[PDB]
Design a protein around this ligand. Structure first.
Ligand SMILES: OC[C@H]1O[C@H](O[C@H]2[C@H](O)[C@@H](O)[C@@H](O[C@H]3[C@H](O)[C@@H](O)[C@@H](O[C@H]4[C@H](O)[C@@H](O)[C@@H](O[C@H]5[C@H](O)[C@@H](O)[C@@H](O[C@H]6[C@H](O)[C@@H](O)[C@@H](O[C@H]7[C@H](O)[C@@H](O)[C@@H](O)O[C@@H]7CO)O[C@@H]6CO)O[C@@H]5CO)O[C@@H]4CO)O[C@@H]3CO)O[C@@H]2CO)[C@H](O)[C@@H](O)[C@@H]1O
Length: 213
């Protein structure tokens, strides 16, 4: 048994009839770890699984929940999220003997611009944090860039920043899935957003799309 290669979340906040099984992005270089930026309504109810149609709930004795976001997570069968908000839903699925051990973490919605367009910030600095929208269909909005170069964007977790980084590719959010050393152009030029002073990024994480203005 090795760690799972896929992970999905299903629940009321994605579709009121639980028809949407949202695939999670793999954390780069960390087998069995996954992340997804999701809006949870107040009292949302959900489960997750390693494959579509597999339901794992909060009762499962393989599951531990860590709240680092003030989400408020309880329940009998379904996970229940008390406080409405955007959260980074994070799953670590390790192997323990012949079974999985799952650690579910709720991180706060902290998205950052990194790199040359910020004048060289490669640190978590709230000057470069995106503004968070109030609603499920809203946009995260970056501060204005102050210099030219390739955009880098990421979520904040406990790991190195670039384990959970992403870009835009023809207007779609694309999560890093390779050993990116220096530039997105190592995958292709259409992955590299060239920013200039005054440009702004807008991201719609429910639709999976974004733009540079
Ligand atoms: O003191 C103990 C310390 O010693 C060693 O470290 C040495 C380095 O060996 C040496 O080169 C030099 O480092 C300088 C560097 O030369 C300067 O350029 C500058 O570095 C800046 C850099 O210029 C900035 O752009 C920014 O880097 C970003 C980077 O742009 C970005 O793409 C990303 O990079 C990570 C990448 O995405 C990952 O995939 C991975 O890449 C790995 C590959 O996975 C692996 O397979 C292999 O190929 O190595 C790749 C490169 O490591 O990791 C990348 C990060 O390492 O993120 C970075 C970081 O934000 O910022 C850096 C500064 O952080 O300054 C440094 C000096 O600070 O001098 C240092 C000694 O000071 C030893 O290697 C190190 O472990 C020890 O701690």
């Amino acid at each position: 048994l090795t760690p799972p290669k896929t992970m999905f979340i299903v629940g009321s906040m994605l579709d009121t009839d639980w028809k949407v099984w949202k695939p999670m992005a793999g954390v780069y270089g960390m087998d069995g770890q996954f992340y997804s930026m999701i809006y949870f309504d107040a009292n949302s109810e959900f489960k997750f699984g390693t494959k579509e149609n597999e339901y794992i709930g909060i009762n499962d004795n393989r599951v531990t929940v860590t709240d680092k976001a003030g989400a408020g997570v309880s329940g009998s069968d379904n996970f229940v999220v008390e406080n409405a908000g955007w959260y980074l839903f994070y799953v670590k699925a390790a192997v323990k003997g012949d079974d999985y051990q799952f650690t579910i973490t709720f991180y706060p919605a902290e998205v950052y611009l990194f790199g040359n367009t910020t004048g060289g910030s490669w640190a978590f600095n709230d000057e470069w944090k995106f503004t968070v929208p109030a609603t499920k269909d809203g946009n995260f909005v970056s501060p204005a860039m102050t210099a030219s170069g390739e955009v880098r964007m990421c979520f904040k977790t406990d790991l190195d920043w670039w384990r959970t980084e992403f870009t835009l590719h023809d207007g779609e959010i694309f999560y890093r899935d390779f050993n990116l050393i220096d530039s997105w152009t190592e995958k292709g030029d259409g992955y590299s957003i060239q920013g200039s002073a005054g440009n702004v990024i807008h991201l719609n994480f429910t639709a999976g799309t974004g733009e540079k203005k």
